[PDB]
Every structure is written in C-alpha cells, then in structure tokens.
Design a binder for this molecule. Sequence first.
Ligand code: FES
Lengths: 162, 175, 18, 101, 38, 82, 222
Amino acid sequence: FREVVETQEGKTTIIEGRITATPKESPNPPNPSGQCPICRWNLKHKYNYDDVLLLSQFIRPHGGMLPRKITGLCQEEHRKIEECVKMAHRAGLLPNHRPRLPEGVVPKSKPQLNRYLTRWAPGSVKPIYKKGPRWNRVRMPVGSPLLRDNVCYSRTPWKLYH
Amino acid sequence: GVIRAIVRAGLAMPGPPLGPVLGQRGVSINQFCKEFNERTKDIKEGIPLPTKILVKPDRTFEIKIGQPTVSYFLKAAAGIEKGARQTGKEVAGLVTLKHVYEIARIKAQDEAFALQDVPLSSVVRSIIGSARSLGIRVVKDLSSEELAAFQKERAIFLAAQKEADLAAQEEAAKK
Amino acid sequence: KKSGGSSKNLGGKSSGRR
Amino acid sequence: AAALARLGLRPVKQVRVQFCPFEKNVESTRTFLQTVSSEKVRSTNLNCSVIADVRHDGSEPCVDVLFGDGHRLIMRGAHLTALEMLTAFASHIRARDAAGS
Amino acid sequence: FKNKTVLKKRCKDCYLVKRRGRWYVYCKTHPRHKQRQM
Amino acid sequence: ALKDPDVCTDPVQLTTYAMGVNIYKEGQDVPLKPDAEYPEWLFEMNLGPPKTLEELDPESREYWRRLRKQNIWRHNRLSKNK
Amino acid sequence: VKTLLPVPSFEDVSIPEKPKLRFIERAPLVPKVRREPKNLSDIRGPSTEATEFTEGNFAILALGGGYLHWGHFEMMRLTINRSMDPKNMFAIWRVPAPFKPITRKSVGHRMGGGKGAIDHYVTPVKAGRLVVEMGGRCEFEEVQGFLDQVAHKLPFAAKAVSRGTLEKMRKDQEERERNNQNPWTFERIATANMLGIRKVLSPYDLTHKGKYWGKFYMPKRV
RNA sequence: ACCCAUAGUAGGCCUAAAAGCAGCCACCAAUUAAGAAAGCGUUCAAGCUCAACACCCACUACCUAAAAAAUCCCAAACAUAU
Ligand code: FES
C-alpha cells in the first residue's frame, strides 16, 4: 500500500508518498479458474455478516468499502460483501475500523442497544405504529435479501421479515 | 471581448445594431466613428467587410478588418444582385473554374485561411461548397454566348416572381 | 323518488315449440 | 479541475513543474502540468508563473509552488497521483488566503 | 421541496441522494428543483 | 435610399475578367490566364455532388469524415425530440 | 479512436400525403337505434385482429383489453400529431372509430323500467392488438418517448413497440415455454381436467391457458 | 463521466432586422477533428451546453417506483442442528 505524509519545516511543506508492505493472496487457491476472489476460494454462498476475517479484507482502515476494480470482486459479490460490512459495523464487530474523528472530537455518549443483522441505518427507520391486519402485516426486515442464496443447513429457509 | 459584425465600409452610424452594443459595454460611439471612417477611407464605400473589434482595457478597440465575405465576391462575380431564394432548384448564377481560382487567391490572403497555411487547393474546395449554397453553379468552361442565352430566360422567370408576390399580399391583407 | 320510464318492447312471450 | 478554476491562482506567484519525461513515474506530474496549463486556470492570475523545468538527469519529478506570502509547497510526485496533488494544491490556496487575512 | 412519486432531475446541477430512507433531489443552482420522494 | 452597390453585367466582360477581384479603386479587372498556366488537377476537381460511401475508398480520409458527419447527423436527429 | 458505425438509410421509405392521424368522430355517421348487449367477451382474451405490422415500423401494442372512447382518440391524436415530425414520420390508426353503443340510465333511477338510452360509443380492444402504427424516416428511439406517453394514458396496459422489440417479445415468451423447468403447466392440468380443476375454470381457460384473467393479460404466465 | 471547442460564414432567401437556433430551401468545405447545428439562450446579437479531437475507460444492475380517518397497535416471538 501507499502512504502520503505532509511535513512542514521552516514555513515549507513537503508532501511525499511511500510504499509500505503489501499483502499477497495465499498460494494455491482451491479453484484457480475462479473469476473473483470469492469463487476462487469456493466461498460463494458461504459467508455472512459475522465472518469478519473475510469481510475485513475488503474494507479501508476507517471502515469504508474498497472499490470493485481494486479488489476484483464480481459485481454480485461486491454487493453481498458491501451489505455484510454494513451489518458488521452495526453489530459492533469491527471495533477498529471506526470513522476518522477530526480534531480529536469526543462524541457525546449514545445509548447502547445491541443489535445484529441490521439491514437499515438505525436513524433512518420509523416506528411501526399501525401493524396492520394479518393479511397485510407491516413486517420488520432482518438480514439482507442479498444473502438469500446462502447455503441453508436447515429445512426452513432464512426468514428475512419478522 | 471581441465584437464580430460584418459592416459596410464607411457607413458606421450611431443607430442600431452597432450603437446599443457599444453603449452597453461603455465604448464611445463617437470615438468609434472617428476611428472607423478614417480607417475606411481607401476602401470602396458600401463593401461588406468582416470586422473584429478587439475591445480591450480601457475600452480600447483595434478595428482589424479582413477580406470581404466570399458571398459578396461570388455574387458580384456572377453578375447577380441577390441570391437564390431556394437553392438547388433555382440556378441564379454561373461562374467558371477560372473565376473561382482567382477569388481564392484573394480570399486565401484573409487572416482566417492564411494562419492555417493550407494549400490553395483546400481553399478552392471551400469556394465551390459555398457557391452551391448561393445557387451559383461552377462550370469548367463558359462562353459568352452560353451565358447570354440563359440570361434571357432568367429575365422571364424573374419577372413572374414579382407577380407572385402581389398575390401573396392579398392573402396577407385578410390576416 | 324519480319518475321512471317503461320498456317499449311487447310480445316475445311464446314458449318453445318442442 | 473545476474547483481549482473557481478558486483561482490568486495567492500563488510562481509554480515550477520539474520532471524527467523519459522516466516511468512522471505521468502524475505530467498530468499536473496539463490541468494547470489550461487557459481557464492560467487566466485566474496571469502573473502567476507556470514553468516547465524539463530535465533528463534522473531526479524524481517535483512541483514547487511559491506564494506571494513567501510560503513554499513541495510535492514529490514519484508516488503521488495528479488528483492527490491538485487536492493538496487547492488546500494551500484556500489556507494561505486565510492566514494572510 | 415538492413531494413526488417519480423523481426527475430538472437540470445538470440537480443531484439524486437517498437520505432518511428515501430519495431526494437537491439542486444548489435552482433550489426550486428540490424534490422529496413521496 | 439604402441599397446594394453596383453589379457588373457585361457578358463579354464578365467572361474576360474576374470581376470584383480588384477591390482597390485604381486596380484593374484581372484578365484570365490561359489553360497552360494552370495545373492539371484543376480540371480533375469534383464539380458535382459529393462521392457516396460506395464511391469513397474505405481507407481514405474523406470516407471516415463523411461517415462521422452522418453519425452526427443521426445523433442530432434522434435527440431532436428525445 | 471512436469506432464509427454505418447509419441506416431511409431511401426505401416514402411518406404518405397525409402523415398525421385523421380525425376520429365521436359517434358513427348514421346513429344506431338497436341497443346492444354488454358483450364483454370483446375485450377478453387475445386479439385476433390487427396483431401484425402493415405499413410502419413502430406501434402501440395493447397489453390488455379495454374500451377506447372519443376522449382517448383525442388524446392519442393531439399527442401524436403534436409530437411527430410530419416531414419524416407518418401515423395510421389501427383501431376503428367508436362503433359499440353504450347505454346509460337517467341519474337517480331505480333498477327496472327497460334499458337506458344510448349515451356514447366505444371501440373494444383486445390484448396483443396494435392500436396506432407509425413509420417513416425515423428510428424507434425517436418515437418511443412520446409513444410511451400516449400508451401510458390508455385505459388498458399498453406499450410502445418496434418491428424488432415485438418479435423478441414473442421469442422470449416461446423461449420461456420451452426452457420452463416446472413439470406442471396450467394448460396440461386444465386440458386433462386434472384434480377436477375445471370446476373452478372457465371453458375459455382451455385456450387462455392461465395467461388471461378477465381483461387483464399476464405476460409472466407460461 | 471526465474533459474539451478554432474556421469559409452573419450560407443565401425571408424578414425592420435572422447572425446554428422566426419560417423558407439547400446542407457542401478547412485542420487529426468540431452538425450551415440537438438543447438553452438573447437585441435579430452575444453568451452556455451537447454532438467532434486529444487523454483515456466513468462502471451502467434489471424492469421498476406512494400514501391519510374517525374508542385503543394488535397473539407472543424468531433469520442457523440435517
Ligand atoms: S464470485 Fe465468481 S465472478 Fe464473482
């Protein structure tokens, strides 16, 4: 990877770029014919929001996603890994990939509400004051429909609406 | 700001459209007149001249003028006073390759073609295309007798045009 | 409430001939 | 750049672009020259110099910016992108203006 | 804002963003173009 | 009172001189050099309608420039009503 | 180095003398006297008329059944004539003028007392019919915009189609009927009265094969 | 998406004037390339985009878009063990 450093000395600023150590794909992918990193390692349909060892390899130090052209992911798996990282952040599973805070700002405290499988941004959802009849019931989404094709080891498929 | 307007030599007037444009930008019209008419003394009055008023701080204007429009050149060289009303259906003039070649020699001297340093053939190609829009057909060789015959027929067609205009005025009178 | 009209088609009451 | 033309080269006084075009890591520095050489950007401040110190010695490309206040900005473009330079360059223009006033 | 079921950019500075769970049209040039998803 | 300037109309003169080429009052209407004094390609110039794509060579400049104009003609046409 | 491609040439297409859509009258020339039954079967099921292109290259395809009244023709005409290029485009009607009489009773009347009086006229349209046909020196992109506007304002589901999009639309439906991996199809079950299913089906369902429900067409059904 | 824009010429005709952009016809030429012009514009002007050139890949998925009533929401819940 590549860094950028700005050092100001004697009213003079010097902006440079250094090349740091770079990781490399582990040798012998179980499926070298795979197109994207996922299919090359027989990982399609086999990861979830809690598999951070996988998800942490496709995000920036501050929790942002990395571009598809750089990672090489298929457009499809990019959307799965993108949703999975959104949910992993909201589950408190990426406690080091936190947003950069300018000028040492100390955020005001928030209520701790543990959560998992959170499809929507918490501040963006309204209360369900009128649940509606049983034949038109306003449901609560759980998980993501992007992961519907994940391998299900139970005879019942994932329920995405509670 | 560069002001572009094809004006006639020595006929600058304070009235529109020249006036309002100059006044809006603050350029003195009287100052323009004093310079223009003096700079247009050796040129035949009434000649359509593409001008280029290089207005610059503070309202300084260098009136650089180029060769007359190629429309003028061709229309005058064909002996007609107006252009074709519907070109492609009405041939209002005839010229030879020699007439076009010599007009190119004068028009190539214009700053527009001179700055491109193009061969004369390229400029000649431009004249032919511009001619086909004015109704003038370029011919390889034309005799004085061939032009006289056509001109006689051309008078008949031109005369009938006047009568047609009167009929249109009657219909416009009701509207 | 509203005065209504009447059908203008009479007859047509014969039964099938078997 | 659009933001660079809107902001202008007002505070800048001399911009020197040095590179060895026969090298393989000057594309960013050569791109930096293209954007600043525009009639748009140069017009914002005609006095502001734009020099092209083309060399062939092997030194990494450099961009030297001299402000009217006397401050200097040195961007070593060997491992920098043109976009990174223009964002950094615009930041100093926005900064030196506030420092003076 | 005007509430709209179909959001249409009216210009070239009119940009589409999703905030608060719905789509918006914000235009800094022509504020009269601002739309809200209904 | 305002009209266009004078137009020469003498048939023979019109055919013996390039009228209007003299723009200087003292200048003289330019007589026409003879055939020999002109290059051969002048009489090989295309005085008719432009060559079509079939007539043009697929490896020539004019061909592609003509094709480009047609592509632009279309673009304008299919955006007129958008 | 953009790769230019040839453009189609419109030298094999002539424009009719009257490219615009003619005016459509509200009611027929001679008024009808005999009042007619409701006859709702005339917007039910697939169309067997005006299902193919004749002169032009683009059209509005009806994706459902319904009745066109005069207000629809006025909307079709003014929108098409105002939006077409008369020099390079022509437009022909593919539906007849309103001919089916529609009766209404006086306001506030009770049931009974004989049938009501003829009120207006309509034109029945079945799904799969061309409503209006266009052609000329244009591509589909040029007309698709405002043909979609008029189609969206029709009393049934409709869509602007081309000589080509119509064909691929039909190839896709036949492709689906062939690669359908479901061993159970509506037709198979309903033709064999499997499960005694005809106790809930119409006789018409033997030919509609589950693609039609009243006047509605379902292009997803195979 | 990013960029980028010179030139015969304000093509004639029409019109008080029309200059790419009233309406009329025609739509050829310059340079590697830029429509007698697609959208905006004005004083008919000028201006601002788009279509070209150059650099060179933006990523573009697939079709899509909604809601309100009156006593008090309405089982509780749940994405994971064949
Ligand atoms: S998972 Fe194989 S193409 Fe993306």
